[PDB]
Amino acid sequence: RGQIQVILGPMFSGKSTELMRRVRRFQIAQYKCLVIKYAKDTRALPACLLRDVAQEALGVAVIGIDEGQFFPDIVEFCEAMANAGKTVIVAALDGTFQRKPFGAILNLVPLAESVVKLTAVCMECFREAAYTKRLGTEKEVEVIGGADKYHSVCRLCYFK
Amino acid sequence: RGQIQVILGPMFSGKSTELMRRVRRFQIAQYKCLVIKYAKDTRALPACLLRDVAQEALGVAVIGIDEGQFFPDIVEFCEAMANAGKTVIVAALDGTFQRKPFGAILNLVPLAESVVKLTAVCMECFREAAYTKRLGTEKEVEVIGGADKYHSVCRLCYFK
Amino acid sequence: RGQIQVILGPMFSGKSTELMRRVRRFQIAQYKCLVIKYAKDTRYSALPACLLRDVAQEALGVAVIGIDEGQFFPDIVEFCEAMANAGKTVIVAALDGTFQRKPFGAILNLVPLAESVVKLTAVCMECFREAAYTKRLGTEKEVEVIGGADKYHSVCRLCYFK
Amino acid sequence: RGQIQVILGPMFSGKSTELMRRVRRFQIAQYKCLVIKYAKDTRALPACLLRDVAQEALGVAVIGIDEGQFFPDIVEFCEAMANAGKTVIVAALDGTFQRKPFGAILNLVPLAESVVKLTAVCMECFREAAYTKRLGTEKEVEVIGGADKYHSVCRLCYFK
Ligand SMILES: Cc1cn([C@H]2C[C@H](O)[C@@H](COP(=O)(O)OP(=O)(O)OP(=O)(O)O)O2)c(=O)[nH]c1=O
Ligand SMILES: Cc1cn([C@H]2C[C@H](O)[C@@H](COP(=O)(O)OP(=O)(O)OP(=O)(O)O)O2)c(=O)[nH]c1=O
Ligand SMILES: Cc1cn([C@H]2C[C@H](O)[C@@H](COP(=O)(O)OP(=O)(O)OP(=O)(O)O)O2)c(=O)[nH]c1=O
Ligand SMILES: Cc1cn([C@H]2C[C@H](O)[C@@H](COP(=O)(O)OP(=O)(O)OP(=O)(O)O)O2)c(=O)[nH]c1=O
Ligand SMILES: [Mg+2]
Ligand SMILES: [Mg+2]
Ligand SMILES: [Mg+2]
Ligand SMILES: [Mg+2]
Ligand SMILES: [Zn+2]
Ligand SMILES: [Zn+2]
Ligand SMILES: [Zn+2]
Ligand SMILES: [Zn+2]
């Protein structure tokens, strides 16, 4: 009985922490677990493509993926692992700094048995934040960074 | 202080009921409300394009949209209404009978402050259902119908 | 495989609507369902009862039981626990707090027995932010006073104490 | 604008982890935070009574409380702090090993703006667990321990 669970939200909403909470629940109950992280975010197997890690994932019952937006093969991997009877849990940004779909990640939603969107605190007005604002002027989608380069932000502060 | 809330799920998960629950909360507190329904679902203003109802929506504080996947202008409408300070609540299928994104509806996710995926009961094995199976052989995406044409289904029953 | 699900929240949060949404999911899938309402709440908008024991026999022939306004049944705990242990799905909509923000009857005893517990939210009728509580408008002091928005406001913390 | 949030669940459901997730959200946004833990669970200020820690809590905007069931003054403390404009977040067991209310903790529910009940994995059948079973024969409520002394369990496994 396989499954895909998706944890969405802006930056600073605790997506990775929620991923680990969910994974630890199975681990403490003696399930074999594997967590995959995107190798280029360096601020628990590192990977750039999920296929590079698929043999390790096959010998496990529960798979966690952190920063799923950066994996070009996120959809085919999760779907194949869930159909092989694995529980797959994915933490990911739903939107880029432009509030557009981040990579292929939203194609998981129609495939998922569970989808949640977490919330952050607006770093500018301190209300609830749904979005991520880029502070600099860089235009490319992939720019690795933390609170130095990004603010979690509400709708009003996003457009300010 | 505008916002977009999205209620996703397969068929038979009570998306419309949850939309009404949320809308009634505001209405009981004296907010002016408008509910829009897709005119072609024959099975509360009917509409085929949201632009056709934009004038009525402008004089209201809370807008509910049922079956949002069928409006080709869902994204621009919701984003415009939320930026104009309105609370927009959207009930929508996330997936077609093929478990692919239904129209443009997933582009709302990165723009929404709240996203939830509801669950149905599998009509074939009676466990939790996340998907919709088409019973017949028709291949086009838009085919209006209820439990006579569709089953809410789990992963296993979907592929049976 | 029985179950207790609990839907909490202040007044005007849509607890009854969420109850019905959950019950209809099972019904549309061919499960036999029963909904029980508190007989003394005769407000405009499904078996009426004052004690859940009085409808136990009907409940035994069904797979899914919904209970509206569970706070008013003195036998809520033993009924739900017995039905869930007999393999039924029991769904309970109830106020968690009185107008005094105190536990409403025996209803919180269900929480340690329940596999699912949610607390819904209302809109503050005085400042229009999120409301978690119910304020009584009049001066009556007894717990049980039936009424709607004529007698009660859903209210935030600050408006509750105003 | 003060607030009480309550995180309930059986053992091994990640209540502490969810508490920290929520606290870190505020901290990363520059709020002053304090976390209080029950001093007698020695498996972040330790305390036996919340009143012993009330002066520290007054100089802070966000207060987290771990294992709230063990503080006899949980209700008056949280209510007082929330009315003073603080955000109070409480992780706690809802039920003892006998599935009875654990201390005074349920009296927080009618005072709280947010209440959630987390789930664990059944350590005996591996389905969803809502309860905690004591493995030994000791009869007193307070017995500190982990997976050595307790299993998270479903309804059926609880009564087996
Ligand atoms: C918004 C955005 C982020 N990023 C990068 C910045 C970060 O390195 C990474 C975000 O990782 P996350 O793990 O999503 O960021 P986080 O740790 O703040 O979130 P959480 O607390 O929820 O775990 O993605 C982009 O490259 N492009 C973008 O448009
Ligand atoms: C799955 C699927 C449904 N449909 C149609 C069938 C229905 O008429 C409509 C589904 O609308 P819904 O409002 O999703 O159906 P519902 O009433 O069961 O929903 P709920 O109980 O959650 O309120 O879309 C398609 O046209 N194509 C598809 O691929
Ligand atoms: C708060 C409170 C309510 N009541 C009564 C008033 C109502 O008759 C009943 C509350 O029923 P509800 O069904 O909780 O109220 P509702 O129908 O407005 O809420 P929802 O939208 O969530 O369904 O209890 C008391 O008798 N004493 C009290 O202290
Ligand atoms: C069920 C139960 C637990 N305990 C004790 C045992 C532990 O020391 C403590 C457990 O509190 P928790 O913090 O709930 O234990 P946990 O670490 O499993 O929690 P989580 O993973 O959700 O963060 O309570 C009792 O004393 N009596 C009881 O009846
Ligand atoms: Mg991260
Ligand atoms: Mg519908
Ligand atoms: Mg009601
Ligand atoms: Mg703990
Ligand atoms: Zn802001
Ligand atoms: Zn099935
Ligand atoms: Zn208010
Ligand atoms: Zn079990």
* C-alpha–C-alpha distance, residues A17 and A36, integer Å: 14
Write down the domain spans for chain C. Answer: 1-120, 121-162
Binding partners of A (≥3 Cβ pairs within 8 A): B, D
Q: Judge whether A66 and A91 are in contact, CB under 8 Å.
A: yes
Q: Judge whether D41 and D152 are in contact, CB under 8 Å.
A: no
Domain D119-160 has CATH 3.30.60.20: yes
The residue of chain C with its CA nearest to that of B27 is: C123
A74's enclosing H/E stretch is helix A74-83
Domain C1-120 has CATH 3.40.50.720: no
The DSSP output letter for A159 is: T
The annotation status of A114 as a binding-site residue, yes or no, is no
CA distance B20 to chain C (A): 9
CB count in 10 Å sphere of residue C1: 10
D131 Cα: distance to centroid of ligand 12 (angstroms): 10
Q: Judge whether C36 and C58 are in contact, CB under 8 Å.
A: no
Nearest CA-CA partner of B49 in B10, B12, B75: B75
Question: Do residue D25 and residue A18 have CB atoms under 8 angstroms apart?
Answer: no
- Pair of tokens at residue A66: 């952190």
The DSSP output letter for B42 is: -
Nearest CA-CA partner of A75 in A101, A40, A39, A56: A101
- Pair of tokens at residue A39: 């190798």
* C-alpha–C-alpha distance, residues B114 and B121, integer Å: 24
A93, with CB counted inside 10 A (0-12, 13-18, 19+), is buried
Query: Quick check: is C58 catalytic?
Result: no
Binding residues of D are 9-16, 41-43, 66-69, 97, 122, 125, 141-145, 150, 154, 157
3-state percent helix, strand, coil for chain D, nearest multiple of 5:
30, 25, 45
* C-alpha–C-alpha distance, residues A22 and A41, integer Å: 22
* C-alpha–C-alpha distance, residues C117 and C4, integer Å: 9
Pairing of strands D62-65, D33-38: parallel
CB count in 10 Å sphere of residue A29: 20
Beta-bridge mates of residue C38: C49
Give, in order, the Cα–Cα distances in Å from C71 to each of B42, C58, C106.
39, 21, 7
Beta-bridge mates of residue B132: B152
Give, in order, the Cα–Cα distances in Å from D10 to each of A12, A92, B9, D89.
27, 28, 28, 17
Cβ(A5) – ligand 1 distance below 6 Å: no
Nearest CA-CA partner of A62 in A40, A78, A51: A78
Give, in order, the Cα–Cα distances in Å from D106 to each of C32, C138, D111.
33, 27, 10
- CATH architecture of residue range(s) C121-162: 2-Layer Sandwich (3.30)
Question: Do residue A99 and residue B110 have CB atoms under 8 angstroms apart?
Answer: yes
Residue B69's identity, in one-letter code, is: Q
Q: Judge whether B64 and B54 are in contact, CB under 8 Å.
A: no
The answer to whether D121 contacts chain C (CB < 8 Å) is no
- Pair of tokens at residue A36: 């995959």
In b/e form, how buried is each residue of D116-147, taking b as 16+ CB within 10 angstroms? Answer: ebbbbbbbbeeebbbbbbeeeeeeeeeeeeee
Q: Which are the contacts of D137, defined by CB distance < 8 A and separation ≥ 6?
A: none
CA distance C127 to chain D (A): 13
The answer to whether A29 contacts chain D (CB < 8 Å) is yes
Nearest CA-CA partner of A2 in D154, C27, B155, D139: B155
Q: Judge whether C76 and C67 are in contact, CB under 8 Å.
A: yes
CA distance B28 to chain C (A): 7
Residue D65's identity, in one-letter code, is: I
* C-alpha–C-alpha distance, residues A109 and A4, integer Å: 9
Query: Resolution of the deposited coordinates, in angstroms?
Result: 2.4
The residue of chain A with its CA nearest to that of B101 is: A110
B124, with CB counted inside 10 A (0-12, 13-18, 19+), is middle
CB count in 10 Å sphere of residue C107: 25
* C-alpha–C-alpha distance, residues B86 and B50, integer Å: 15
The DSSP output letter for B146 is: S
Task: Tell me phi and psi for residue D7, to 5 degrees.
Answer: -110, 110
Cite the DSSP H helix spans in D8-154.
15-27, 54-58, 74-83
Cβ(B96) – ligand 2 distance below 6 Å: yes
Report how this structure was experimentally obtained: X-ray
DSSP calls for A123-155: TTT-SEE-EEEE-S---SS----STTTEEEE-H
Give CA angle at D44 (D39, D48), nearest 5°: 25
The residue of chain D with its CA nearest to that of C1 is: D156
* C-alpha–C-alpha distance, residues B41 and B48, integer Å: 10
Q: Which of C12, C29, C154 sits opposite B121 (nearest CB)?
A: C29
Q: Which are the contacts of C21, defined by CB distance < 8 A and separation ≥ 6?
A: B14, B17, B18, B21
The annotation status of B33 as a binding-site residue, yes or no, is no
- What superfamily does domain D1-118 belong to in CATH? P-loop containing nucleotide triphosphate hydrolases (3.40.50.300)
Cite the DSSP H helix spans in B59-154.
74-83
Give, in order, the Cα–Cα distances in Å from B41 to each of B100, B157, C11, C21.
21, 27, 33, 20
Give the mutation target among C69, C91, C92, C95 for probing the ligand 3 site: most ligand atoms within 8 A of CB. Answer: C95
The answer to whether A15 contacts chain D (CB < 8 Å) is no
- Taking every pair of Cα atoms in chain D, the longest distance, rounded to a whole number of angstroms, is 49
The DSSP output letter for A53 is: G
Residue A120's identity, in one-letter code, is: A
CB count in 10 Å sphere of residue A73: 14
Same fold across C1-120 and C121-162: no
- Pair of tokens at residue B61: 């504080």
* C-alpha–C-alpha distance, residues C72 and C61, integer Å: 24
Question: Do residue A24 and residue D17 have CB atoms under 8 angstroms apart?
Answer: yes
Give the mutation target among D7, D150, D151, D153 for probing the ligand 4 site: most ligand atoms within 8 A of CB. Answer: D150
Q: Judge whether D64 and D36 are in contact, CB under 8 Å.
A: yes
* C-alpha–C-alpha distance, residues B151 and B8, integer Å: 17
CA A105 centroid distance within chain: 9
Torsion of CA D50, D51, D57, D62, to 10 degrees: 40
